[PDB]
Copies of this chain bind each other. A is one copy, B any other.
Amino acid sequence: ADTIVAVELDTYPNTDIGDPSYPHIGIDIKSVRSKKTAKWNMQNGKVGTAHIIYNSVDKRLSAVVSYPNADSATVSYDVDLDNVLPEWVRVGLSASTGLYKETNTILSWSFTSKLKSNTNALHFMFNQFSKDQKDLILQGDATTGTDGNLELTRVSSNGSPQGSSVGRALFYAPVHIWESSAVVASFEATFTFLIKSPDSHPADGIAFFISNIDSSIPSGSTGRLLGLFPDAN
């Protein structure tokens, strides 16, 4: 199967598969059952911001999520990504809905990776998404262009989110995260999102993920599986 490393923004508590009894952020290593979670005070209809950072010296994957005029939520986990991911990877965003639903809108997205030997770099930034974004790989129900935004999951014309939807968006160019002569390897990611729902129980969430370059959406990965994992193991 695919190799997945992801930071999940989980809006629906599936307590039967390890989720806490509240909206949360988590670090997923090849499993939907997070290795580490933190309580997330999610706000319906508000624009949020997420930061993800990592470097090969400290070997620590940390993430910070916040809303304007509010306190932030953070979570960290010690993991050597060189022992999990291949040398060449692709980065992207994923989201899903099930019987419960929500809008999974992305307003902006930036990413930067550095390889310092004894310096190679890649940086891209989207502040608006065009109708034909040729430097993005869209999978599933993901579409671009609507109000210059990226809609990961299906949304009707009236602006109402649909259930049983799943979509992913990956950057076109592969990313080099390890090299034999490298002394320091690091990356940082930032994206702004807008989750809206007419229901009192939104679902299922958004995730930033890193995977093998030929990764595709697993079958039946709608709902709680966030379009990343084939099962709940």
Residues on B with beta carbons closer than 8 Å to the beta carbon of A116: 51
In the assembly, what is the distance between CA of A117 and CA of B66, in Å? 9
Q: How many residues of A contact B (CB 8 A)?
A: 47
Asked if A85 CB lies within 8 Å of chain B CBs, one says no
Is the Cβ of A121 less than 8 Å from the Cβ of B118? no
Asked if A44 CB lies within 8 Å of chain B CBs, one says no
Asked if A179 CB lies within 8 Å of chain B CBs, one says yes
Is the Cβ of B58 less than 8 Å from the Cβ of A128? no
A 145-174 to B, binary, CB cutoff 8 A, 1 in contact else 0: 000000000000000000000000001111
Binds B, one of A30-38, A67-75, A92-100, A217-225: A67-75
Asked if A39 CB lies within 8 Å of chain B CBs, one says no
In the assembly, what is the distance between CA of A128 and CA of B120, in Å? 7
- From residue 169 to 190 of chain A, which have CB atoms closer than 8 A to chain B? 171-176, 179, 181, 183-184, 186
Q: Which of B51, B118, B125, B174 meets A66, CB within 8 Å?
A: B118
In this complex, the member of A51, A88, A120 whose beta carbon has the largest number of chain B beta carbons within 10 angstroms is: A120
- Count identical subunits in the complex: 4
Q: Which of B62, B123, B130, B183 meets A57, CB within 8 Å?
A: B62
In the assembly, what is the distance between CA of A128 and CA of B183, in Å? 14
Residues on B with beta carbons closer than 8 Å to the beta carbon of A122: 123-125, 135
In the assembly, what is the distance between CA of A74 and CA of B135, in Å? 30
Is the Cβ of A76 less than 8 Å from the Cβ of B57? yes
Is the Cβ of B121 less than 8 Å from the Cβ of A117? no
A-B contact pairs, 14 of them (CB 8 A): A49-B118, A53-B184, A55-B62, A57-B74, A64-B184, A67-B118, A88-B132, A119-B127, A120-B125, A122-B125, A128-B181, A130-B176, A130-B179, A172-B172
